[PDB]
Amino acid sequence: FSENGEGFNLLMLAQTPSRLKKGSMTFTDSLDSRIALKQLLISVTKGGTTELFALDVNRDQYAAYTATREYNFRLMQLKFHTSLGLGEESTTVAGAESALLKDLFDLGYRIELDVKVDGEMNVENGNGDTSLRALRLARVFDKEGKEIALTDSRVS
Amino acid sequence: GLLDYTTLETNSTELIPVIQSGENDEQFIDPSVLPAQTVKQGKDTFDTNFLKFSENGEGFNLLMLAQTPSRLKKGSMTFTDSLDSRIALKQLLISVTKGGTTELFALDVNRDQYAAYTATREYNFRLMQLKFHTSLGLGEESTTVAGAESALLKDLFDLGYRIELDVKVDGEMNVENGNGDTSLRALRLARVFDKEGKEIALTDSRVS
Amino acid sequence: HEFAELFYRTYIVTPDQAGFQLSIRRNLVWEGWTGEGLSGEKQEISKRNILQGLLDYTTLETNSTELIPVIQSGENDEQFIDPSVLPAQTVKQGKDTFDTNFLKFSENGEGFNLLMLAQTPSRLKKGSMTFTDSLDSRIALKQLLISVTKGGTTELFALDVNRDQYAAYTATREYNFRLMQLKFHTSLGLGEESTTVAGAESALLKDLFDLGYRIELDVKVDGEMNVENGNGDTSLRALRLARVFDKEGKEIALTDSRVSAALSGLTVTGVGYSLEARLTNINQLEMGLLIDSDVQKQGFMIPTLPPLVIVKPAMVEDDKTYPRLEALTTAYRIQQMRNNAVTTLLNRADTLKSYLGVGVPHPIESNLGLEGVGQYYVRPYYNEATIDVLNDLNNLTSAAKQTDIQGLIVSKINEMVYTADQLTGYTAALEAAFSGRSPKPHVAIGTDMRLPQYIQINGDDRTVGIGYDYTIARISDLRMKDKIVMTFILPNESEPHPLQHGVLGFIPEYLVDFNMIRNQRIGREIRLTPRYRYFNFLPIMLVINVINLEEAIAQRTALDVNETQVTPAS
Amino acid sequence: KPAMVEDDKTYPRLEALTTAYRIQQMRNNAVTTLLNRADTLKSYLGVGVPHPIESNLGLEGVGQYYVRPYYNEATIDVLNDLNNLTSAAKQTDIQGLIVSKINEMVYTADQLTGYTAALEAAFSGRSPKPHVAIGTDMRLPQYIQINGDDRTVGIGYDYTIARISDLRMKDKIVMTFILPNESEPHPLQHGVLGFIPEYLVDFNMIRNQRIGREIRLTPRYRYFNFLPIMLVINVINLEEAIAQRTALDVNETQVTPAS
């Protein structure tokens, strides 16, 4: 996430060695209208232990870039503003089960976080940026689908 | 009212933030940074101040903030009150700081490129959307608020130079129930301009 | 009313629309693709508007077909002169950087093949040079290089001889018959201020240069060039000192004492040269200039406004306490069209003053913080001038003071409008947008009830400057009290257009009349809910503040005659 | 243009190419050449000092066979060279100030170069009065309008005022001798434009293994100079003279003690 505010040029990072042999040019190309994030890598850390969750975000419809022609005739907008849940069967990238959330998962609770990510992309130029805006623990569910407050002693 | 402009000009259907101490005071920047400003709508006398940015926390509610004693006496807030189609950012307040001295300037972002909520729905059919992304700069004579000219820019100003700022502001509003928030995404110094309108390097001795 | 009408043309909108969209076409030009910078770079290349190119000259023009010699280290060094005499020079053509030196004069050996000699790095990727390309219909020398040696010190002079009378290649009929010919027997001069390549006067000729003398060298250069396969060779035929010119242009004898002293032991030799030849291909391997287009579109929303409420008991209608509906209508019309209009005008003026500085024209698409679509047609400009009538005026005698003040104010308005036209490039945009007609700018004048009696001229021909049309506005709001606003508008059309100062977004609202119940009371209420919003398009405005008028008229005016410093003090 | 569709926005029609051609050829190159002409004459000859006829054989142009070479420049300080009676008469007096200087320079150039003799010689049976051309920006040319003085560029003279938008000639007047009756290349007009039209072509280029259609327009022309004469006038601080009071700069010329 580029919180320094300086963007990236996507047509650079993705030039393959075949294209290098093919030549060196990325400026007559055009990106398709379809842009969406594959995965959000969120780090669950507590006391120095880090777990990585490879979450497939492509299957939430708010992760799809939408065209808002308000600056130029080729910019499109990204607004993924929802909650993702980490269930008991959530698996790490290496394939192991959760460890920091193991205490709640063995108690059958479900943890979901509100994700507020914003970005922009231009097809013609390749200019674009996407920066994290707001992420936080949100609420806790039980088996019966009854909300459990964050301030409850069993989960606080 | 044909000569003076105040006899006919009155507003009584405007939402304005209102302050009352220690009971709703977490949507307002602490008064130790800026004293409260007195504004009068209708016959009610009350104080207002800029709503604060919130990044990782809960947003604000405009309806609960904009409830004036005239509306108290008429009855408690109901659910049929509706927000208008046009909502805009009036003032964006920044502080230029160098050496411990704080100078605040009120940018009149009202009437800027995209300082007005545009109809952009992705979740609800009511969610109003704002994307205020533009280069907003300070001129070579732009006087600070509360009188006089700024001192921290005295050297650049006396040389005839101009500075520019990039502003990235995002915010969402729901005209159905009064829930929404605003966040600051990026706001930094970007470029410096000469009196002849030609960009010079940021590595120049005077500019640095 | 007239006043808000001049600065904002009314635009009616259907009630259902909640906002109207303004999409404009803009034509773009930029040089090449960005291509590789690391393996490429994010395209920071300035796509600059073509109308900007109407004003400055660096937007256009490129040299992309010149057959500039290019050195390859260790391959063709022997055609170029020895780099000991002169280090490599770098010139830019498009996106390439490479080193160039003047060619060596062929004496007896094989000549040079220019086409294979002119491989820029781009052309190498472009594919190996094959002979289906043909040279320029005319070729010539760019610069001629000689070395003035006196005692051992060498000085270089880059004699720019291009566009000489006798430096253009010509056709001939011998040997081959695609052959071009270069006969160059001409007198070259070395000016009394002429500077070397490094940018300094000739030390060996400083003494000669002091007495106001010029050196003329007769030069003889010949060579051949073929336009079929680029073969060509040239040789130094004859070059020597010939004669001397003076400041007043009469030949000075070579045996004269001054000349003989100045020309002791001076030897002049030729070293190098260059050719102005361009590959006039039939399909072109060059991108020349690229033309692109973007679309920019702005949003505009029309709010709701506080309602205007009537009260009247409803079994009988009154005409004495509440008149016909005209009262509500006129109250709404004044409240809309005057108070809000003046407020938005002054707010616009102060916003421009804050953002844009004073008297400085900013380039297109650079420092915008305002509204419009005119910024893509004209450079922004804002300026203000204060008039101290008491201290600035010219009057020999009384019974002419009115003419005096009107002359000063008319001169000031002329200067403002003229400088605005000259700097903004507004009239060029007006000409470009409208084809088949060339309208002159129309200037609007808004002010209080004072100045109209002085801006209407009684006794002089000029009023706003002949060649300009005007419309005077009179208004009684105290915010305009002793103030003048100025701008450019177009009164011949009634549609949203980029060159109009402003448009009044106006949605008609129909009067509603139905019984309403306040605190369980019954009466007929006539409710008017207005909606509108004053918009702006053009970011150009001129404002003049005139003060001390009363004092100037009532108090003794006095010729501020310039006592000018002829009695020793300066 | 990508060669699988056609447009009107991303495809600017032939009109856009025509406009680009018009700009590049008609204005910018001509102005560059004129300023280069001025600079090279300045360097070769110097200010105010002519040269004998047929004293140059390698100087650009051919019309050195008829008129002595001459180049000169001058400046006007409107701030200090302005006497005013009434602020309702100031503008006319400024215009007269500029016009008189124009006239005097024209007369001086004519007298030194002997232009009238050349015009009478090269044309048999005609005695045409010289024609002066006015190249200037778009701020001045409203300041050559007065009837305050009968002389506009001087009696016995016809003139034409030309505008231009380019900023490089800010408040600069360029003057020369032309001839409006001619339409052929002759050594008495300032110069001719060798112009030959060309037509555009559109065809599929496959370069570096890419697909696209390109439209090419080949302009071919050249600017040439004949007359080695030109006069340049500069106007400085025109705005200040209007801006502040400029009353009688009355020189109090010392019938007083100590002088």
Author numbering:
A (entry chain D): 132 to 287
B (entry chain Z): 80 to 287
C (entry chain Y): 28 to 597
D (entry chain c): 339 to 597
Would you copy out the relevant sentences from the publication that reported this structure?
The Klebsiella jumbo myophage ϕKp24 displays an unusually complex arrangement of tail fibers interacting with a host cell. We observe the tail fibers are branched and rearranged dramatically upon cell surface attachment. In this study, we combine cryo-electron microscopy methods, protein structure prediction methods, molecular simulations, microbiological and machine learning approaches to explore the capsid, tail, and tail fibers of ϕKp24. We determine the structure of the capsid and tail at 4.1 Å and 3.0 Å resolution.
Each pentamer consists of five MCP monomers. In comparison with a gp372 in a hexamer, the N-terminal in the pentamer’s gp372 shows a different folding direction. In addition, gp372 in a pentamer changes the relative orientation of the triangular body and the hand compared to the MCP in a hexagon, which makes gp372 more curved in a pentamer. The interactions with the clockwise hand region are reduced overall, involving residues K380 and R558 interacting with residues E220 and D163, respectively. Nevertheless, we do observe a small opening at the center of the pentamer that may be capable of solvent transport.
